[PDB]
Each structure stands twice: as structure tokens, then as C-alpha cells.
């Protein structure tokens, strides 16, 4: 279990917080001489770099956009003098992909994983009342011992080029907000809630972790601040009579309030009373079935790359609502915590995905996810280091996101090898670990490439429901062969039906690249009309199987990828353009999903 | 009465034809010296030029693209020896806009009007069994004394620049096929058919004009070649028992055969395909074969990448497959008569045509699309140029009607588009055009024209002349667009309520309505110029149309993106197309398909 708290920062009497967002100093370190040359003390010749954002798309030259290797940030903040006697942490929403944090010259901690928060305890070096310095050494290379997976090519000048095993640009930097926070010396470290429904009434079971021994009181407030339940102890049950349940696209948020007393700490968070259970082939939310309708997405916008902005969230949610979606998948990595906060208010359902993408050794991975070629990926001697990373990223993800009502499943892989017992052994461990970290035991899943065929795949028995990525009519029998493609699709769904697994299937990826404004009569692959015809055919197949309980189309919006001959300025399978405007097919979803 | 035949060329024993399409020789004449310098005998420094085609879009520099003034074409053809003792004509489908034809050095004839055939009798100068020469001086300037109307600016270096009073590019040259043909010394010059429906049977009234006095017999053949009627005489009635009528989008064509007989011999033989059908306006209704018809389709343009107005059959084939997928039954030949092939093919496919003379730009404005609702009168029909303009307007009408009157597809003549009509000088002008048109058409079929918003119900003086009234309105675009579209609808309905209150008891067709739409431009919520806005503008205008019993047709503007003269309001032509210039469909094309599948 973890040496820090994953809880979002708040500001009350006992807990303080100050934003470090703004313009930082930035400098590339291509010869990797920073540590030995005093950069922990300040950067020798930096530039200005916005935070949060991704560094790549600001520059005007290739070597800098495509930089791969070591690079540094530095900034300076004044701590209020009133934060003596408090524990003081730096909280980075993310450090992509790995980094060591230095503060006032001292190395505080290093982290691996570029999509989950990083906590640095600077209590012993922070100078309250004075100006303080923070310096972060970051690395954005890809390998097969960390997620997401890939490789690093050295070119003739010795400069490094990222060669990912995934299909999305390797944005990196400090992409999410950065805080400095003050906690009490005895503090709430973690807590977990589970829900039971008793007719109209409800139980909120909870457990609490603290950095101390003092008694804990837990209060639960309704939307208007009035009290509805109170229990003493670090373990308890809250009784909410005539409970107001969090519903799909109709949220109700209670407020939990955790206290440590003699009052030493207070933590407050919005939660939603709802239950998630798989009965047979159905997904039950509050004991009634739900059908998932929505999109795979990316944290991706012009200029900012993966940088968080609230304006992107607002628009992306006003578009999801306009299509009448109810659900999205945080593909292929946990998002910024603000996305889940807002999903909670709006009643969207989230499949939360750990970044286990790239577990097949292929640099053009999307044509290759149906080629039939096994890459011997889980037979290699780096696999134990990889497994340790994957489990640690699952643990940090679940701890961070488990108390959001919108999060209803965990996706623990996208398009890996599953056709050999080497991969069963691997994934069995991962699921085992995820089952222990989630106090609610909500459904665990992953998304399968076409190569994980019903006859050969070893891993679908680990899944509570099964997610399929399928491109019938695009990478398989596309264009004039599109009727062959429908058959082949039905052929496979027939074989899955024949297995009588009695579990739900969700299509988590299907789509066509579509250039906005390419019209052709008759339609051709890449036009707007072909996208509509494609979707109308996948819909017919989905609607032919009682156990298909969900469609998450790929993608919500055009996004940026590694450049290559099959990628025309990124990936054009969006239903919206990258500036968040709808292609002709968005209307297809809107109508179907009403 | 015209000094030549408008009859399309055929090839039998009595009548022979030869195409002159190919690379011709071409030369600009900016100093206007060709005649004094002997260009009538050949050009001194030519380049090659495709025929048929408009010259403008081939070149890579502005001076040649935008050329305005005199320019010359030349080619050479071999006349077979066997054409001695025939009358030999050159037949240009069109010479744009005016020209003078020369054959082996000799001025044969001159013609004014850029969109109808030019016939030049070269019988005295032709040399059969030898190689012959044709040379044409063309001028593409615009003025206020011919159609279509514009003006001509002289730049500071002496260059002429066309400044049209219309919104389409001033393509010009030899835009249509060219033939040399041989006719008999006694030939059929002209004929005309009218029809009456007799239950299962039908009458084909007719009349023939020849160049001599030998007698005529007229035969009528069904679709399979079999004889169904015969009559002696230059005027007659053919009696067709168990007639197959020509019906909208369900065409049947008879062959008519006109012979000039020397007892047991044949002197001339002309064959055209025709279609029995009747057209009549009864009250507010447009009756085809005695049932009501709702017009659904488009205003078009003879326009295409590289070719300009140049004629190609593939442009036809694609454009008709698109109209059929759309479920249209109609189109208007805005704003000039088309190549004859367009009509021939509309006959096979059963489309209805409104045939438009080129009477456009009768109002002095160079940005004339912002000005058809401005409210500003330009005294256009009180100028002393007007009597000359009237004469060539009538002349183009007579030539259009004489040419096109025997196509079943042609159900009405449009004699103006967006002129000034709020004035008695304009009533007196158009009373003459309409009176002329009535006489040249043997079927006395409906005559109309299209009115700008400026020609309000209270002010207009010209709508009485029309058998039905065509309106060009842009409520939701030029008027009260974008955020104000709610208001554009109430304004529209207020105008229609005033037309209603006049109780004119005539049908109204909407011949223009549309929005510039950039393919690929998507906005949510929609904005003027987005594809989404096109669809909404349309849904709005349909609600208005459907609120009025007397609205009996809707021709959207335009079938396809097309080229205009350039300027700040024109992003590479006009983008009111429902299809792109390369004839693929924007999102509002299915709006039409669905509405029109489920009308009548
Ligand atoms: Cl460069
Ligand atoms: Cl130039």
C-alpha cells in the first residue's frame, strides 16, 4: 500500500493549497548532463513553458517537437509563513512519463508512470515564509518495462526518436495542474465507500485511513448541506433513509465529511449512492439494466496536446449530451481528475482505463491488430518488471478514482496478446491485484483486438464483461467488400454466441477514418457518407445479439498521432473534428441514442 | 421569319454532316486590327484551342483568362467531292457573344447572341473535293443593347475588362460543337407540333415549312419503328390510335418523319423524336396530360472545371444521374438556352424544362445579388439604348422558341430573370416581348419569368403578363440570416400573405432559394456558410412553401457550385450548389432526396 495520499486537494481550516500553474522554466537535456552539472539547483539556460500543457506543439522546428529523452522544468513559489508545523507536499497531477522531483536542491522522490498524480513530501526542506524552488527532471522515452509500451530509436546524430507501440502522439511534459499543499500532522490519508440498497433506503459502508490514532467521525450531508447520517469509527455504516440515488444522466451528490477529533483534520468529497452489478448478460445500475452509449476519447486538443483545460471538458460534455450519449471510456490512460468530477455532476458512466496499451511489439499497431502475427511478448525477460509497473499503475488508478460514482468498470488492457498461457499468467496476477484494491469489487474488463479469436484466446474468462474492438468494414473487407465484412462479423459473433458464456459484450472500438468535407456519391472509404454507411451496418450486427449491452464508438474526436503514411495529420476516426464540430455521422448517433 | 433553319443536323442520304470539333487555331486581337490586316485569310501567330470549350480557364496568366474584346478562331476542313449540288452550311451551336463568320476569305454572315445556333450559308464559296478554311471574329464584351447585359471598363493600360450585371463568369468563345453540313436544294426548314388528348387516342396537329413547292408527306413512327399515322400536306392532323403519352419521368417518344416528295421519289427527309403531352394552367394548377404537377428540381448552369460552358455529354450523364437520385422532375435553363443535347436527353429521361432566354442583368449593378432586394431603382428601361435591347431580346426569344419548341420536355418559357418591373417603362417593354413570344410558339404554352424581391406586390407592374409567377427569394440568407432567421420566416410569410390577398388565382413557382455552403465546413450550432445551415434554411423555406395552396413548384438554387467573376463576396465562384462543382453532394442534397421521394 502507498506511501502517500491520492486525495484531491481542498482548502479549509486544516488543509491549505496553492497553485503552481503558470509559466515555468524549461530546458532540454540531450547529452544527459543535468544531474552532474547542478541543474537540480536551477536551470542554466531555460525557456518559458506553460504549465499545464504538453511542450511539443509550441515549437516551430522538428528536433524540438519530436524531442525524446531527458528534459527539465523549474519554478519558484513563496510559501505562506503560516504553513509552519503543517506537512507540506507538492502534488503534480501527472509527470509524463517519468521524473525525479528536486526541491530547494534536494531530491524528494522519483515516479514512473505518466498519467497519475505524483506526491512529493517537502516538509523537511520547505522554507515557510521564504521563496522556494522546485526542479523536475523528466524523461519521455518508451520501453517494454513501463506503460505505455514502445521503443527508442537512435538516429545517426545520436538523437533519440520515440517509436511507440501505440497509435497516439507521445505527448509529454507537465500536462496537468500542479499544487503545493499543507496538511495537518495527523491527517486523513484515504477512505473508501461501498453501497447497498435496501428498498427506498441505502447503506453507505465506509472505511477510513489516517496517519494517526485519534478517533474518526464520519458525516454525510445531502445536496443542500443538511445532515442525514453520522457514525463514529474508521469503519462504519451510514444509514440514509429515503435516499436520493445517483442515476444515469441524472445525478444526485451527497457530501461525505470525515473528521479527526479531540478537531485535527477535515476532508470533504462529493459521492453518489449507486450500485453496479453484472447479472447474467446485463449491466445493472441500481438493479435495473443500462445500455452503454458513447465514445472512446483522448485527452487531446490543438496547441495544448494533453494539457488539461476546463473549457475542453465543458465543450466535450455539451457534445456528448447533444449526441445523447451516457458513457465514455478513458482511453488509453486515466484522465485528469477534473473529468471524473464533472462526470459525477452530469451523470455519465465511465470505464476507467489503466495505460496498458502496446503489449504487442508493432510500430504500425492498428493494421497489425488483425494481421495474425504473435510477437512473443509475454515470453520475454522484461515481463516481470512490466508486470510490477502495471500492477502499480492499477493500484494508483483505483485508489484515485474509486470513490467517483461515474466509474463503473476498470479496463486493465487495450489490444494485448491473449492467445497463449504466458499472457494468462500475466493478466491473472493483474486482476487478482485489482480485485484487492477496489472496496466495491466493480466489474473488471479489458478490450480485445481481432487477433484474440474465440478459439485461441486464454484471457476472456478473467473478465466480468467482455469488451471487443472490431473494425469490420475498415481494416477488414472495407469498401466494395463491405457485405463480406458484415458476414464475417456475424460469423464471429455467432462463434461467441455459441460459447454461451452468459456475460455482457460491449463494443469499445469501431469506426472509419473520415476526412471532413470529403463527399462522394457513391461513397468511398474516407468520405463522410462511408462513415454513415459503416455505422448503420455495425448497428445491425450489434442489434442481432441479446448479449451486446454496449456500444462505445471510436473516437469522439480526431486526435494527433505519430506521423506516417497511413495517418493524415493524426487519426480521423473522430465523429467530431478536433475543434469539436460534428461530421455527418454524429447525427446518426444522436438519433439512434434517443 | 428567320433566314435559316434551327433544325438539329442529321445524317441520311439527303442530308450529310461533318464535325469540325478539334484543335482550332486561336488568336487574341487586343488592338482590333485583324480585318484590315487580312486575318480573314488566316491568323498570323495562333495558338491551339479546343473546340468546343470556353477559352478562359486554360491559360496560366490573368491577362488571357480575363481577356475582353476581339479574338479569332480558324480551322481547315476537307469537303467531300460528293457534296457538289447541295446547299452547304456551317452550323455553330453558339458563338459567344457575337461574331462574324468568314469562309475562304469571304464574309459570310454576322450574329449577335451568345447562346443559340449560328447558320452561315457557304454554298457559293465552298470548294468540294478540296480543303476549305473557316475563320471567325468573336467579341465577348458586354453592353446594354444585347443579352446578357453588362458594361466594359477600360483599364489604365488600355485593357478591356468585362463588368457584367450578372453573377456568373463571362466565359466565351466556341463553346458548343461545330458542323459543316449539306442540305438538299429543296429542304425542310422548320416544323411545329401541337397536341390534343382524345381519350385513348391523340391528335398531333402540325405544320411544315420548306424552301420550295414540292409536296410534303408526314409519317409518325412509334418507339419500335412501326407506322401509326400518315398525312399529306404542309399542315395536317396525325391521328394516333392508342397513343403512348409522354409522362413526367416516364417518357415515350415517337419519331416524326417529314418528306418532300417528287412523285415516287424523295427530295428531303427530316426525322426528330417527339413526345405527345399537353400542358395547361388551370387556375393555380399546372396540368400535364390533364393532371396536376408539382415542379421539383433546380436551376442549373452550363459550368464545369476547365471546360467552362463547353459542352460534354458526360457532364450531361452525370448531371442527370444526380437529378434522378435527388428525385427531381424539373430544371430551369438559368440563365440562357443550353446546348441542344441537354434537351434531347431530357426528352428521353422525362424531365420538365423551363427554357430561359438570356434576359438577365436588366438593372445597372455590378454586385447585383446584394441588390435584388436593396430597393434601389436604376431607371434602366427609360434609357435611349432600350429600343435596341428590345429588338435583340425579341430576336433571341424567336430563336430560342423556334429551336426548342418541339421538345416534350419544354413546358414553359422564362423571358426574364430579376429585371426592374416597378415602372410603366418596364410594362411597356415586356408587353412587347410576351406578345412576340406568343406568336412564335405553335403550342401557346405558358410564359413566365423570375422576379427579384425588389418587385414587390404593391409596386410590380409585370406579373399580370405571366401565366404563372416565378419568385427568387432569399429569406434567411441575403435577408435576415443567421441569428435572425426566425424573422426571415415571418418576413417571408408576410410577403406571401400579400400575394395571397391579391387572389390572382395563378400558380407560383419558387425558382431561386439557397445558401452559400462550403463543403466540409461544420459548426454546432450552425452558422451561415456551414452545411448544417444549408439544411435548416431549407427546412424553413419548405414550411413556408407548404403553407400556400397556390405554390406549385420549387426549383432550388443551384444544382452545383459554379464559377462567377471574382470579388469579396465570392470565394471561388458561387457556393449555393447542392452539389459541388465536381458533382458530389453536400449534406443538404439528401434533404431534397427525401422531401421529393414523398411529394407526388
Ligand atoms: Cl527545422
Ligand atoms: Cl500573371
Q: Show which of A156, A184, A212 is a domain's final residue.
A: A184
Same structural domain, B376 and B349: yes
Min CA distance, A321 vs chain B (Å)? 13
| H-state helical runs in A59-174 | 62-65
- Enumerate the active-site residues of B: 418, 512
CA B297 to chain centre: 16
The alpha carbon of B503 and the centre of ligand 2 are apart by a number of angstroms equal to 57
Best interface-test mutation with B: which of A318, A520, A521 has the largest number of B CBs within 10 A?
Answer: A521
Nearest to B522 among A516, A520, A521 (CB): A516
How do A444-448 and A466-469 pair as beta strands?
A: parallel
- Whether the upstream peptide bond of residue A332 has omega within 30° of 0, thus cis, is yes
Which residues, in sequence order, are bridge partners of residue B196?
B203
CB pairs under 8 A between A and B: 28
Task: Give alpha helix (H) positions in A323-404.
Answer: 337-346, 365-368, 383-401
Nearest-CA distance from B519 to chain A in Å?
A: 5
DSSP per residue, B501-563 = HTT----EEEEE------TT---SS--TTSHHHHHHHHHHHHHHHHT-TTEEEEEEE-SB-B-
State how far the Cα of A275 lies from the Cα of A272, in Å rounded to an integer.
10
Nearest CA to A80 out of A29, A127, A133 is that of A127
Cα B313 to chain centroid distance, Å, stands at: 16
Contacts of B586 in chain A (CB under 8 A): 519
Distant-in-sequence, close-in-space partners of A407: CB < 8 Å, separation ≥ 6: A340, A350, A351, A352, A401, A442
Provide the β-strand partners of residue A92. Answer: A118, A178
Asked if B520 lies within 8 A of A517 by C-beta distance, the reply is yes
Distance from CA of B290 to the nearest CA of A (A): 36
Contact A521 B586 (CB under 8 A): no
How many other CB atoms sit within 10 Å of the CB of residue A531? Answer: 28
A40 an active-site residue?
A: no
**Chain B residues inside the 8 Å CB shell of A521:** 322, 325, 584-585
User: Are residues B160 and B34 located together in one domain of the fold?
Assistant: yes
Q: What is the dihedral of CA A552, A556, A559, A561, to 10 degrees?
A: 10
Query: A336 with A312: CB under 8 angstroms?
Result: no
Question: With b meaning 16 or more CB within 10 Å and e meaning fewer, what string describes A283-294?
Answer: bebbeeebbbbb
Residue A436 corresponds to which cell in the numbers above? 484487492
Number of the ligand closest to the Cα of B64: 2
Centre of ligand 1 from the C-alpha of residue A61, in Å: 4
Task: Sort out which chain A residues have CB atoms less than 8 A from B518's CB and list them.
Answer: 517
Query: Considering every ligand atom, which ligand is closest to the CA of A64?
Result: 1
Where does A418-573 show beta strands of DSSP type E?
444-448, 466-469, 505-509, 548-553
Nearest to A581 among B325, B519, B524 (CB): B524
Q: Which ligand is nearest to the CA of A63?
A: 1
Helix axes A482-498, A528-542, angle to 10 degrees: 30
Find, among B88, B3, B54, B7, the residue nearest to B402 by Cα.
Answer: B7
Q: Cβ contacts (< 8 Å) between A516 and chain B: which residues?
A: 520, 522
Subunit contact A519:B584, Cβ cutoff 8 A: yes
Q: Which residue of A has its CA nearest to B521?
A: A517
Mutate to test the interface with A, among B583, B584, B593 (most CBs of A within 10 A): B584
Asked if residue B97 has a cis previous peptide bond (ω within 30° of 0), the answer is yes
Question: What 3-state class would DSSP assign to A555?
Answer: coil
| Nearest C-alpha neighbor of B44 from the set B21, B23, B28 | B28
Q: Answer yes or no: do B261 and B341 share one domain.
A: no
A220 vs chain B: nearest CA distance in angstroms? 41
Per the CB < 8 Å rule, is B325 touching A581? no
Ligand 1 centroid to Cα of residue B12, in Å, is: 71
Asked if A581 lies within 8 A of B520 by C-beta distance, the reply is no
Ligand 1 midpoint to CA A174 (Å)? 24
Instruction: Specify the CATH number for the domain of residue A345.
Output: 3.20.20.80
Closest CA relative to residue B561, chosen from B254, B204, B322: B322
How many angstroms separate the CA of residue B323 from the nearest CA in chain A? Answer: 12
Same domain, B518 and B470: yes
Domain final position from B260, B278, B296: B278
- State chain A's maximal CA–CA distance in angstroms: 76
Q: Ligand 2 is a single-atom ion; what residues have CB below 5 A from it?
A: B 61-62
Q: Cell match 433544325: residue? A: B7
Nearest to B258 by CA among B195, B212, B209, B185: B209
Q: Could you tell me how far CA B102 lies from the centroid of its own chain? A: 27
Q: Which is catalytic among the residues A141, A396, A415, A551?
A: A415
Distance B159 CA to ligand 2 centre (A): 14
Residues from A in contact with B at Cβ < 8 Å: 319, 322, 516-521, 528, 577, 581-584
Separation between Cα atoms, residue B119 and residue B69, nearest integer Å: 23
DSSP codes joined into one string, B380-414:
GGGSTTHHHHHHHHHHHHHHHHHHHTT-TTEEEEE
Domain of residue A112, CATH code: 2.60.120.260
Grid cell, residue B224, equals 419500335
Query: Among residues A87, A79, A70, which one has the least CA distance to residue A104?
Result: A79
Q: Could you give phi then psi for residue B420, rounded to 5 degrees? A: -80, 125
CA distance A234 to A186: 14
- Asked if residues B212 and B234 have their Cβ atoms less than 8 Å apart, the reply is no
Does B584 contact A322 at a Cβ distance shorter than 8 Å? Answer: no
Cα–Cα dist B535/B517, whole Å? 10
CB contact under 8 A, A521 and B584: yes
Of the candidates A375, A291, A288, the one whose C-alpha atom is nearest the C-alpha of residue A326 is: A291
Are residues B472 and B374 part of one domain? Answer: yes
* Chain A residues within 8 A of B523 when measuring between CB atoms: 581
On chain B, the residues whose CB falls within 8 A of the CB of A519 are 519, 580, 584-586
Residue spans of beta strands (DSSP E) within A22-168: 22-29, 47-51, 70-78, 87-92, 98-103, 106-112, 118-121, 131-139, 150-154, 160-164
Residues B523, A319: C-beta atoms closer than 8 Å: no
- Say whether both B108 and B193 belong to one domain: no
Q: Which of B520, B536, B559, B589 to mutate to test the interface with A (most CBs of A within 10 A)?
A: B520
Instruction: Tell me, in angstroms, the distance from the centre of ligand 2 to residue B531's CA.
Output: 34
- Domain extent for A93: 1-184
Resolution of the coordinates, Å: 2.8
Please judge whether A516 and B524 are an interchain contact, meaning their C-beta atoms are less than 8 angstroms apart. Answer: no
Same domain, B257 and B296: no
Cβ atoms of A178 and A90 closer than 8 Å: yes
Nearest by Cα to A538 from A548, A547, A528 = A548
First to last CA, chain A: 44
3-state SS record for A2-43: CCCCCCCCCCCCCCEEEECCEEEEEEEECCCCCHHHCHHHCC
Q: Which of A248, A275, A302 is the last residue of a domain?
A: A275
Looking at the structure of chain B, the number of domains it has is 3
Give the single-character DSSP code of B360. Answer: B
The ligand with the least distance to the CA atom of B66 is 2
Report which of A174, A181, A171 is spatially closest to residue A126, judged by C-alpha positions: A181
Mutate to test the interface with B, among A517, A533, A589 (most CBs of B within 10 A): A517
Which experimental method was this entry solved with? X-ray
Contact A319 B524 (CB under 8 A): yes
- Name the residue facing B524 among A521, A582, A584 (closest C-beta): A582
DSSP string, B3-57: SS--PPP--SSS-EEEE--EEEEEEEETT--TTTTTGGG--SS-EEEEESS-SGG
Q: Do B235 and B331 reside in the same domain of the chain? A: no
Give Cβ neighbours of residue A36 (< 8 Å, ≥ 6 apart).
none
Q: Do A233 and A220 touch, CB atoms closer than 8 A?
A: no
Q: What is the spatial distance between Cα A296 and Cα A328, in angstroms, rounded to a whole number?
A: 6
Give residue for cell 469488451: A467
CA Rg value for chain B: 24
Residues 6+ apart with CB under 8 A from B569: B367, B369, B370
* CATH assignment of the domain containing B252: 2.60.40.10
CB B449 within 8 A of CB B434: no
Q: How far apart are CA B321 and CA B24, in angstroms?
A: 32
B174 plus B201 within the same structural domain: no
How many CA atoms does the CB half-sphere of B50 hold within 13 Å? Answer: 17
Of the candidates A298, A348, A352, the one whose C-alpha atom is nearest the C-alpha of residue A323 is A348
Q: How far apart are CA B571 and CA A563, in angstroms?
A: 32
**Residue environment code for A45-76, b if the CB has 16+ CB neighbours within 10 A, otherwise e:** ebeebbbbbbbbbbeeeeeeebbbbbbbbbbe
A174 and A201 assigned to the same domain = no
Inspect the interface and report whether the beta carbons of B519 and A519 lie closer than 8 Å. yes
Residues with Cβ < 8 Å from B359, sequence gap 6 or more?
Answer: B147, B148, B393, B396, B415, B416, B417, B419, B433, B449
Residue A33 φ/ψ, nearest 5 degrees:
-130, 10
Among the bound ligands, name the one nearest to the CA of residue A59: 1
Sheet holding A178-183, edge to edge: A16-19, A178-183, A87-92, A118-121
Q: Would you state the cell numbers that stand for residue A430, as one nine-digit string?
A: 493483474
B88 phi/psi in degrees, rounded to 5: -115, 125
Q: What are phi and psi of A497, to 5 degrees?
A: -55, -40
Which residues of chain B neighbour A518 with C-beta distances below 8 Å?
520
A533: closest CA of chain B, how far (Å): 14
* d(C-alpha A101, C-alpha A226), whole Å: 42
d(CA B27, CA B540): 51
| H or E element in which residue B344 lies | helix B340-349
Say whether A577 and B521 touch across the interface (CB within 8 A): no
- How many whole angstroms separate alpha carbon A300 and alpha carbon A170? 11
Contacts 24+ apart (CB under 8 A), B591-597: B591/B535, B591/B538, B591/B539, B592/B296, B592/B326, B592/B327, B592/B328, B592/B538, B592/B556, B593/B325, B593/B326, B593/B327, B595/B296, B595/B542, B596/B296, B596/B326, B596/B327, B596/B328, B597/B327
The total of other beta-carbon atoms located within 10 Å of residue B590's CB is 17
Answer yes or no: do B322 and A521 touch at CB < 8 A. yes
Longest dimension (CA), chain B: 77
Radius of gyration (C-alpha) of chain A in whole angstroms: 24
Cell matching residue A507: 463494443
Taking residue A91's Cβ as centre, other Cβ atoms within 10 Å add up to 22
Closest-CA residue to A119 (of A190, A68, A51): A190
Contact B531, B519 (CB under 8 A): yes
Ligand that comes closest to the CA of residue B65: 2
Among candidates A319, A518, A581 on the partner chain, residue whose Cβ is nearest the Cβ of B523: A581
* Residue whose cell numbers read 442527370: B320
Contacts of A591 in chain B (CB under 8 A): none
- Residues A214, A140 share a domain: no
Q: How remote is the CA of residue A574 from the centroid of ligand 1, in Å? A: 30
Task: Give the whole-angstrom CA distance, residue A402 versus residue A399.
Answer: 6
Residues 6+ apart with CB under 8 A from B435: none
Nearest to A351 by CA among A250, A464, A514: A464
The percent of chain B in helix, strand and coil, each rounded to the nearest 5, is 20, 35, 45
Rounded to 10°, the helix B588-597/B531-546 angle is 30
Looking at the structure, tell me whether residues A212 and A63 fall in a common domain: no
Task: Decide if A353 contacts A409 (C-beta within 8 A).
Answer: no
Which residue from A335, A296, A283 is spatially nearest to A510, judged by alpha carbons? Answer: A296
DSSP labels, A163-232: EESSSS----B--S-EEEEEE-SS-EEEEEEEEEEETTEEEEEEEEEESS-S-EEEEEE-TTS-EEEEEE
- Between strands B551-557 and B295-299, the pairing is parallel
Measured in whole angstroms, the distance separating CA B311 from the mean position of its chain's CA atoms is 13
- Tell me the C-alpha to C-alpha distance, in Å, between residue A487 and each of A510, A522, A532, A541: 16, 22, 18, 9
A345 alpha carbon – ligand 2 mean position (Å): 61
Amino acid at each position: 500500500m502507498l506511501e502517500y495520499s491520492e486525495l484531491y486537494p481542498i482548502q479549509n481550516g486544516h488543509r491549505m493549497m496553492q497553485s503552481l500553474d503558470g509559466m515555468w522554466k524549461f530546458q532540454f537535456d540531450p547529452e544527459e548532463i543535468g544531474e552532474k552539472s547542478g541543474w537540480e539547483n536551477g536551470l542554466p539556460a531555460p525557456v518559458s513553458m506553460p504549465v499545464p500543457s504538453s511542450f511539443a506543439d509550441f515549437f516551430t522546428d522538428h528536433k524540438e517537437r519530436d524531442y525524446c529523452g531527458d528534459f527539465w522544468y523549474e519554478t519558484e513559489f513563496y510559501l505562506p509563513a503560516e504553513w509552519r508545523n503543517k506537512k507540506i507536499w507538492l502534488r503534480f497531477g501527472s509527470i509524463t512519463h517519468r521524473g525525479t522531483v528536486y526541491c530547494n536542491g534536494m531530491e524528494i522522490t522519483s515516479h514512473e508512470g505518466g498519467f497519475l498524480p505524483v506526491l512529493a513530501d517537502i516538509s523537511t526542506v520547505a522554507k515557510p515564509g521564504q521563496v522556494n524552488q522546485v526542479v523536475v527532471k523528466i524523461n519521455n522515452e518508451l520501453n517494454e518495462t513501463s506503460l505505455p509500451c514502445g521503443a527508442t530509436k537512435i538516429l545517426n546524430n545520436g538523437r533519440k526518436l520515440a517509436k511507440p507501440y501505440f497509435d497516439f502522439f507521445n505527448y509529454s511534459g507537465l500536462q496537468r495542474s500542479v499544487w503545493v499543499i499543507a496538511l495537518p500532522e495527523e491527517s486523513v490519508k484515504d477512505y473508501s465507500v461501498d453501497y447497498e440498497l435496501c428498498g427506498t433506503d441505502a447503506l453507505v459502508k465506509y472505511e477510513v485511513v489516517t496517519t494517526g490514532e485519534h478517533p474518526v467521525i464520519v458525516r454525510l450531508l445531502d445536496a443542500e448541506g443538511e445532515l442525514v447520517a453520522e457514525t463514529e469509527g474508521k469503519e462504519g455504516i451510514l444509514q440514509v433513509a429515503n435516499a436520493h440515488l445517483w442515476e444515469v444522466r441524472n445525478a444526485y451528490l451527497y457530501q461525505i465529511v470525515i473528521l479527526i477529533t479531540d478537531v485535527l483534520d477535515e476532508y470533504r468529497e462529493k459521492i453518489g449512492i449507486r450500485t453496479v452489478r453484472i447479472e447474467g448478460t446485463q449491466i445493472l445500475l441500481n438493479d435495473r439494466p443500462v445500455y452503454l452509449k458513447g465514445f472512446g476519447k483522448h485527452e487531446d486538443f490543438s496547441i495544448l496536446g494533453r494539457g488539461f483545460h476546463w473549457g475542453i471538458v465543458k465543450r466535450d460534455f455539451e457534445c456528448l449530451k447533444w449526441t445523447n450519449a451516457n458513457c465514455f471510456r478513458t482511453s488509453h490512460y486515466p484522465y485528469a481528475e477534473e473529468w471524473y468530477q464533472f462526470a459525477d455532476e452530469e451523470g455519465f458512466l465511465i470505464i476507467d482505463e489503466v495505460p496498458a496499451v502496446g503489449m504487442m511489439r508493432s510500430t504500425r499497431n492498428f493494421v497489425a491488430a488483425g494481421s495474425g502475427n504473435y510477437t512473443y511478448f509475454f515470453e520475454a525477460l522484461t515481463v516481470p518488471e512490466l508486470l510490477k509497473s502495471h500492477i502499480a499503475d492499477t493500484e494508483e488508478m483505483i485508489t484515485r478514482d474509486k470513490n467517483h460514482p461515474s466509474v463503473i468498470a476498470w479496463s486493465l488492457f487495450n489490444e494485448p496478446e491473449t492467445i497463449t498461457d504466458y499472457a494468462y499468467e500475466y493478466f491473472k496476477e493483474v486482476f487478482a491485484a485489482a480485485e484487492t484494491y477496489d472496496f466495491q469489487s466493480r466489474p473488471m474488463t479489458g478490450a480485445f483486438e481481432k487477433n484474440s479469436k474465440p478459439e485461441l484466446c486464454k484471457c476472456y474468462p478473467l473478465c466480468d464483461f467482455i469488451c471487443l474492438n472490431r473494425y469490420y468494414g475498415w481494416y477488414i473487407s472495407g469498401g466494395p467488400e463491405i457485405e463480406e465484412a458484415e458476414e464475417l462479423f456475424r460469423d464471429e459473433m455467432d462463434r461467441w454466441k455459441a460459447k454461451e458464456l452468459n456475460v455482457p459484450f460491449v463494443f469499445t472500438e469501431f469506426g472509419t477514418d473520415t476526412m471532413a468535407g470529403l463527399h462522394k456519391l457513391p461513397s468511398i472509404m474516407w468520405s463522410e457518407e462511408y462513415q454513415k454507411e459503416y455505422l448503420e451496418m455495425n448497428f445491425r450486427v450489434f442489434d442481432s445479439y441479446e448479449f451486446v449491452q454496449g456500444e462505445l464508438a471510436w473516437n469522439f474526436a480526431d486526435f494527433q498521432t505519430t506521423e506516417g503514411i497511413m495517418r493524415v495529420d493524426g487519426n480521423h476516426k473522430g465523429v467530431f473534428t478536433r475543434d469539436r464540430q460534428p461530421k455527418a455521422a454524429a447525427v446518426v448517433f444522436k438519433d439512434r441514442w434517443e
